[model samples]
Target: GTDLTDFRVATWNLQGASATTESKWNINVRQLISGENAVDILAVQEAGSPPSTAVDTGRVIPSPGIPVRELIWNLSTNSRPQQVYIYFSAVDALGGRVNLALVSNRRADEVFVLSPVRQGGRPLLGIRIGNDAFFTAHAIAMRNNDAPALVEEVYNFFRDSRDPVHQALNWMILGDFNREPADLEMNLTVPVRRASEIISPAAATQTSQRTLDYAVAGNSVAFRPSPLQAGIVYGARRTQISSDHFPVGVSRR
Candidate 1:
């Protein structure tokens, strides 16, 4: 019951596919920061289009009573900047993009958007508060064999203070890695802790029974693991409708 840190953080993939409806998405957002499940900041992947609710325009969540805000960032920089609740990347060849969003009660001190190293890859999104940062990334399937390289790039970016957008030293990365902790562990050069390893090493977050989502903290971050579970909305099981990937969260007291 004691404080882990002054804030709590979580990472989840919204699926953002046609299978998930806007109404279902709205309820899931409400459930994410509800009561015992509340988090100060959340890193989201595959956000699809912005929700119809005021979530894009700073809607308030149930717990903490802090208004959650999101901003959209167009990777191409071709269109005029418009206010939105989520930060979205440029559309892919299919004229669609799986957005990376950060929703938090606290104002973001800084925001980082990393363009994909490889052509036609998804952009990485991050939010910084004070000296800590949290990033959300969605890697192409492990079969592409590019997850390791992307992990290295992210690690370097977080550790580097030179990058104008990356002054924060303590960092936590999460999202749909599409690979298990064991598979990604070998790529880390620094001491890192995976939330899945600490909280649910044997658990799966997907209906397919795979552990694709993850929350990993750098050595500098004194993060504590929290239980990874399916999200609840209005006393109902809404995780299935929200996304195939469940949420993974951690705290730093």
Candidate 2:
């Protein structure tokens, strides 16, 4: 993979295009993403689930001077409801639709309601580069505190895999897990570290003033150009950007 350069990474949930075309708001978001803070690897959530008449399925968002060939993880909302997207610059950075799960509705235990859904649907999307299966994740903010159960499913999806993306010697998972550090749900067993811990997020990403994000990686993993170790992206509107969640980036140190 000497043909590849050192990797940079980012993650964001644009709320949803809401319009068929890009707006100034969306354009600014894309500019920051495709401009200086851009990443060779990008993981996005709540982007656009297909067949949703309200959204454009993320086809028109532009990235000038950037290599953003997207690897869509799922085409159907029924198959994966979280609207996950993993975009990479195409080092054959093998990432796309390879996930879906049958989960129970938060109400009614014991088969009261069980169906296929996307609960926290960030794909194990990365490539075999520099001795690792590097990946990022984007789980939407959940009110029911189901983050840990849903995330472990993501872990098992690739942890035992023979697939190319998961076959690398080491692994790392990143992005907005939506679990704040002090929550009862924060004590997860997901097997990662603060690969890119940042400066200030107690102000966190969303407008809620909560530090609910991290770049958790496998304990033994290595990434370059760490965050500043990290910081949140805000718009001219003062902590308000295109989406409720702010974008985060780090070079895979």
Candidate 3:
């Protein structure tokens, strides 16, 4: 077991924590809390109960025992009542969901929900783990035509909002960024540049073509001692019960 300073942090797309009888939410949560698979902080995408068919609900479904300190969630805009939900969790205590939720531990500071102007299907949730560190989960569009523009616009939003933080501390941006890392045009506008480390399942296996998920962090903090290690956990095949998309994990030194 690693201490908080040496602990690992991860962000994953749980695909709405699938409700099938064989769901892996229990296993995933157990692994996270257990010393062997413990992670200090986790960012989750598509992480709420499926929208109720009877009525439109805006509440976030809590994951048992995890204790989320802060929550930034938005219902899908296109649907009569949106189904997509995004949120963040602090390993320590409960933070209510409003615009953003801050954890009980001062170590986990602020939370922000990034709403994309053009694409309202899925919103992005941002969390600040400490004075010098922050993380976010963005669900970009899967289509080709407008995806680039949407991503660029969202990146711009992050860039503008992140200026203040950049001046003060180190930052990390992760999530199911639905675009390929190789997309130079999109990469340039991203909050983290190529100078920073890019970690993903696809990067390891040249054959992995889909742009379903990714993690990016500042170059200075891309390794240990800096508090940010940019990396991805391609559990799509291994954790078949978790979500269709693999969970991506990252850490701060």
Pick by lDDT: which candidate is best?
Answer: 1
- lDDT, candidate 1, 1-253, per-residue tens: 1222456667777777433436534566545654454666677777665455443434332222212245432212332222223544433424333666676656566667665756655666676777666677778764755555556666666655565544335566667777776777766554443411222234676778887776655523233443333221222345346466677666542
Q: Model 2: residues >4 Å from true position, as ranges?
A: 1-5, 24-26, 49-130, 134-140, 162-169, 182-186, 190-202, 219-228, 235-240
Pairs clashing within candidate 3: 9-250, 10-249, 10-250, 69-95, 70-101, 76-82, 227-252, 227-253
Candidate 3 lDDT by residue in tens digits, 60-111: 4334343333322232355332222224333222221111111112233444
Give me candidate 3's TM-score against the actual structure: 0.56
TM-score of each: 0.69, 0.52, 0.56
State residue 145's C-alpha deviation in candidate 1, in Å.
3.0
How does candidate 3 score on lDDT? Answer: 0.43
Q: What is candidate 2's lDDT per residue for 96-180, written digit by digit as tens?
A: 2222111111111111011112643333334434444444445545674544543444345445557554433344344566677
Q: Candidate 1: where are CA atoms >4 Å away?
A: 1-4, 18-21, 53-85, 90-97, 163-168, 190-201, 219-239
Task: Order candidates by TM-score, high to low.
Answer: 1, 3, 2
| Consecutive 10-residue window with the lowest summed lDDT within model 2 | 104-113
Query: CA lDDT of each candidate?
Result: 0.55, 0.40, 0.43
